[PDB]
Every structure is written in C-alpha cells, then in structure tokens.
C-alpha cells in the first residue's frame, strides 16, 4: 500500500466522480491533513489557473505526472478540442494518474505518455502528431529541465510565443534552468512568487516565453 494508493483511494472515496475540482480540492485535504506529497498544490496551482486561462493553449506538455493533480488542474480549464499530453517515468504513478484522471472524467482530454521525458520528446510529433507545443509544465526532476528545454527546442517543439511555466525554481530549486532563460535573449521571464504545496516556505513558479531562434 503506497502513499499515491492512498490518495486515489481518499478521492474515490471522498470526491464526486466527473469533477474536477472536487478532486483537487479532496487532494489538497489529504496532503494538508495526512501525508504531504510533491502535487503543485493550491496556492501555485491558482497562479497556473490564471496562466492557463490567459493563454488558452491548445496543446500542453506536461513533465512530470506523479498524481495527476496538476493533470487534472490544467486539463479541466483547457478548451473543447483542447490537449494535454502529460510524460511519467513511474509506472506506478503513471497508473496512480490515469485512475485520477478517469475519476475526474478527464480521461478523454489528457494523453499519458509512460517514460522519460528525455527519450519521449523526440516521438512526439511522429507518434503523437504534435506540431508545437503552446505551452509547457515542467514539474519533473528538477536537473532535467534545463536539459529538456534543450531538447524541446532541438526537436523544434518550440514556437514564437510558446509559454513554459516551471515549478519550484526557489524550493527544491532549479538553479542552472532558471539562469539559462533568464539570461537568454529566446526567452522572456516572469517570476510568480508564492508557497511550497501544503507549506508557507515560499516557492515560486517561473514563466518563460520563447521568442523563437
Ligand atoms: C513533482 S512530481 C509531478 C507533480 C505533478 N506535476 C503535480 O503537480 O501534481 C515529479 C514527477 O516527475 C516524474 N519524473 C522525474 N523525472 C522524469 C522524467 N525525466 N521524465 C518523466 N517523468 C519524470 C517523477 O516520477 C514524479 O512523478
Ligand atoms: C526529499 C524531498 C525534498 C523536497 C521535496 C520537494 O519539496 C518537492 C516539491 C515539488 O513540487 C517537486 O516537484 C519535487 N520534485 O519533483 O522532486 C520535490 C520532495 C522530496
Ligand atoms: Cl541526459
Ligand atoms: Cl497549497
Ligand atoms: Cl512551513
Ligand atoms: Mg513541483
């Protein structure tokens, strides 16, 4: 019995079936009273509702599922059409995140793809049709987003405008990735400062817009 069962089984038990938010809000009130767990959590996820909507990306990547918490939080604002296409290397989690998904009745919305994110990139476009990505999640290890940054724009994923909105770039930290696009001229950089998940240590997301070539 894992910590990730046992969130699924409090959502089955807890939440309302083909709900979104109810599932979240059943999430938050687990890792807050229970376990805490590495989810973006409520705080930051408000700032990433807020990205979403102003955005209104057709197609989303997203690093690193765990869950399906953050899966669940994008996918329920995407517009009808709308795809998110979420890379997990834990089979576990991967398969923790697609009963989360079915609950919330998101499943029809949200694409998981079971490995690593350095050897899915590169199918992307022939396996799963993707052209550019209109925005990406990182929310994986935090030494490979610099390195998948890389890779995106090797792989030409990358579009004038593109948004990438990465997790914890003050706790755990993501040092050598936020230098890069801070420092870079393909990228244009907003910092949204806010808390851990479940905590007040303050964290924050990153927004860094690809200006292209
Ligand atoms: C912070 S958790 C993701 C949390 C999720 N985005 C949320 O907010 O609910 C990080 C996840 O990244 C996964 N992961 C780490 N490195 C990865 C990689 N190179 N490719 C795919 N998944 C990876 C881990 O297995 C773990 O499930
Ligand atoms: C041992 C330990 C230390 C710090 C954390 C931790 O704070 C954390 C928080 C995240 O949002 C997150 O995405 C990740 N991650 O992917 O590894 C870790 C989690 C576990
Ligand atoms: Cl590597
Ligand atoms: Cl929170
Ligand atoms: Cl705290
Ligand atoms: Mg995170």
Not at 2 to 20: C, F, H, M, S
Not at 45 to 74: H, N, T
Not at 116 to 128: E, F, T, V
Not at 150 to 168: F, Q
């Amino acid at each position: 019995d894992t910590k990730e069962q046992r969130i699924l089984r409090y959502v089955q038990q807890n939440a309302k079936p083909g709900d979104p938010q109810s599932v979240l809000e059943a999430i938050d009130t687990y890792c807050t009273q229970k376990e805490w767990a590495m989810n973006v959590g409520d705080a930051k996820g408000q700032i990433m509702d807020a990205v979403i909507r102003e955005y209104s990306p057709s197609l989303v990547l997203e690093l690193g599922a765990y869950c399906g918490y953050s899966a669940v939080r994008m996918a329920r604002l995407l517009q009808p059409g709308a795809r998110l296409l979420t890379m997990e290397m834990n089979p576990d989690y991967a398969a923790i995140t697609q009963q989360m998904l079915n609950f919330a009745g998101l499943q029809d919305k949200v694409t998981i793809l079971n490995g690593a994110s350095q050897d899915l990139i590169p199918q992307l476009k022939k396996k799963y049709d993707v052209d550019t990505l209109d925005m990406v999640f990182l929310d994986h290890w935090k030494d490979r987003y610099l390195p998948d940054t890389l890779l995106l724009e090797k792989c030409g994923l990358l579009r004038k405008g593109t948004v990438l909105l990465a997790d914890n770039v003050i706790v755990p930290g993501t040092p050598d990735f936020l230098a890069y696009v801070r420092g870079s001229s393909s990228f244009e950089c907003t910092h949204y400062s806010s808390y851990l998940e479940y905590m007040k240590v303050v964290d924050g997301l990153e927004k860094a817009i690809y200006q292209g070539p």
